């Protein structure tokens, strides 16, 4: 099926306590495989998945060099944002960045990404045409003029349509034992009385990969939408994910409620009933 590759970087300044802290992480689908921490001792792009440790030291020299350069660029980009927003030099600010590509079931390029965020809000983002930028405020429009004059999107597109797609196909191959196997969710249901006239039904989904899943409660075939407590999908810690959905029901009316599980690894969507 379709697959994705993403890098997420974060630079947090700390005036008076040294250089800004830079952290970057790389993902294939919902599987992290590399990391870089500017405060770690190695000062190297470190591996985080088994299928990437087979890469030679030439790969690690190349990736360590590119991520170190990004770290220093975000260091001077944090100073620039201070001038743009007229902010003081004592405050701690955040510069975040995401870039990557999406490939189809065959490996063809579908979409590419290249986005910046300052202090948690959108700054600039490469549009779907891989040529123009979405400037989110007056400060980003200064950056949009600079980058569109220096044709920044052209080199960034060459990576997205080429180096990103090639590396993603190469990663999916080396780790096909993990990256390309979908684990369907193991489901169960629990029952908790809260008073003598109400009770809780909790619908569990455990040990599934990839993370995308949909849990829905129904009363007499009608979606609940509201009245349904839904938690964020959470990592189990072993590469699989968890999620549960709970509904509060009047006592004696348990069987009129159903839970519906949709997942990639399910041949048919499940329906659960107490």
């Amino acid at each position: 099926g379709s697959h994705s590759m993403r890098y997420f970087s974060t630079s947090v300044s700390r005036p008076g306590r040294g250089e800004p802290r830079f952290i970057a992480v790389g993902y294939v689908d919902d599987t992290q495989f590399v990391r870089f921490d500017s405060d770690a001792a190695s000062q190297r792009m470190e591996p985080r998945a088994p299928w990437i440790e087979q890469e030679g030291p030439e790969y690690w020299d190349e990736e360590t060099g590119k991520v170190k350069a990004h770290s220093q660029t975000d260091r001077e980009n944090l100073r620039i944002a201070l001038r743009y927003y007229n902010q003081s030099e004592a405050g701690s600010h955040t510069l975040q960045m995401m870039f990557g590509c999406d490939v189809g079931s065959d490996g063809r390029f579908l979409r590419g990404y290249h986005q910046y965020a300052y202090d948690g809000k959108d700054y600039i983002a490469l549009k779907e045409d891989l040529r123009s930028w979405t400037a989110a405020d007056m400060a980003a429009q200064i950056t949009k003029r600079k980058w569109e004059a220096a044709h920044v999107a052209e080199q960034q597109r060459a990576y997205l349509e080429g180096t990103c797609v090639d590396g993603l196909r190469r990663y999916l191959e080396n780790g096909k034992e993990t990256l390309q196997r979908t684990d369907p969710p193991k489901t169960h249901m629990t029952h908790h009385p809260i008073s003598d006239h109400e009770a809780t039904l909790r619908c569990w989904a455990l040990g599934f990969y990839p993370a995308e899943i949909t849990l829905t409660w129904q009363r007499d075939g009608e979606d609940q939408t509201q009245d349904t407590e839904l938690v964020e999908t959470r990592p189990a810690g072993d590469g699989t994910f968890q999620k549960w959905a709970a509904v509060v029901v009047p006592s004696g009316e348990e069987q009129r409620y159903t839970c519906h599980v949709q997942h990639e690894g399910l041949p048919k969507p499940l329906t659960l009933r107490w």
Binding site: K66, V67, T143, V152, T163, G167
Partner: peptide, 9 residues
Amino acid sequence: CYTWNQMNL
């Protein structure tokens, strides 16, 4: 497969 992020704001 990291890219070249040397563009300044």
